[PDB]
Design a protein around this ligand. Sequence first.
Ligand SMILES: Nc1nc2c(ncn2[C@H]2C[C@H](O)[C@@H](COP(=O)(O)O)O2)c(=O)[nH]1
Ligand SMILES: Nc1nc2c(ncn2[C@H]2C[C@H](O)[C@@H](COP(=O)(O)O)O2)c(=O)[nH]1
Ligand SMILES: [Mg+2]
Ligand SMILES: [Mg+2]
Lengths: 196, 196
Amino acid sequence: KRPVRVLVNMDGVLADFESGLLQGFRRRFPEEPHVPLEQRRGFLANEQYGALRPDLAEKVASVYESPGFFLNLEPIPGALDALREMNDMKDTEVFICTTPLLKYDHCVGEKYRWVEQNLGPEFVERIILTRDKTVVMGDLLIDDKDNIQGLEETPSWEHILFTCCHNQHLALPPTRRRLLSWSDNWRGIIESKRAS
Amino acid sequence: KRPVRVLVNMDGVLADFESGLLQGFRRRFPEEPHVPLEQRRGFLANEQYGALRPDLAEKVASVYESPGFFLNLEPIPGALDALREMNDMKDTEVFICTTPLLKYDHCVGEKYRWVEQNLGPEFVERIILTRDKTVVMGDLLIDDKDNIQGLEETPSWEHILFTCCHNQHLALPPTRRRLLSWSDNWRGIIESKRAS
Ligand SMILES: Nc1nc2c(ncn2[C@H]2C[C@H](O)[C@@H](COP(=O)(O)O)O2)c(=O)[nH]1
Ligand SMILES: Nc1nc2c(ncn2[C@H]2C[C@H](O)[C@@H](COP(=O)(O)O)O2)c(=O)[nH]1
Ligand SMILES: [Mg+2]
Ligand SMILES: [Mg+2]
């Protein structure tokens, strides 16, 4: 009876943060070692760059902390079509659920404008900003972060791992479901939740 | 056993939106009719000003849509002391839960900076921005809005009505609890929830 509610993450799922960070890094520090997308491992890019050479952590962070960085991210392939499709499904409710940087200054505002410009004013109404996704109530959370924790020990949602460069090689127990891309069958996953 | 989680609203509860709007209106439109705080009725100020005279709705909105308006709000009396006290209580979890304007441009960013400057970086981590509070999981919601609705028919929280100029004369059924101000016994209300 109930509609199925789907929480959809922003960076790594709708907005291509990883491609935008690499392109920004190579343009600004053309002389420096970089991490090709295929070689990304672990959720935080600055930690990987820092393991390469300590000062590069600060350098890569200066890219995502710049004015215009979040504003100008390109969409993830197929994301805008899929989210429009999903939003029009009957008895289906969509929210966009995103964690801003602690350096919020050029992040929070740019994220609202990104959604307005790439999706539309109607989607702006459905943004939730939070540093703890476990306190948001939904049936599914589609998110590229490997392991999501916070104050609620047993969240109401099932986490569906959205495949991204940094989690592609990650081994998951059979109980954890993945979405390989927006061409994978996210429609069937929604139906599995309705059925329970 | 569980900690008690308290969602605390921003405008009308921590930040004095109503006093800041009136002061801004009288300074910018000194020649126009105004609504004294004591005479405020109903949640939306622009609707009341619009009922006074149609063009005044647009004029009052121009105040809260200005750069610097959210940034510079004064705190509600006793709010900063009480939220610090509450946050240090054992087995008690606090989040700040706020709805931004659909005209987000000078609202979203200013709200983050308000919390940093009036409360501290630690409180910035606990902001949730949403247009639907019913999908946020907590035990209590302390909020000045008369009636809170959204997609979840039976929210997990009990709404505690925080008294404000615009809701002071509102008659509520005996089942609805009010907080008269931050000098009223919010500590006992938290204990009532722990007990269940
Ligand atoms: N500190 C830090 N934050 C990062 C890094 N990469 C991405 N982020 C932040 C940027 C976004 O605001 C936030 C996205 O979180 P999420 O909503 O779970 O996709 O993650 C990084 O390398 N270091
Ligand atoms: N459109 C409109 N919005 C208002 C008015 N007064 C306050 N607001 C908005 C400003 C805040 O972003 C939002 C606060 O909602 P809340 O989180 O429930 O306290 O309410 C008004 O008169 N008209
Ligand atoms: Mg993400
Ligand atoms: Mg309020």
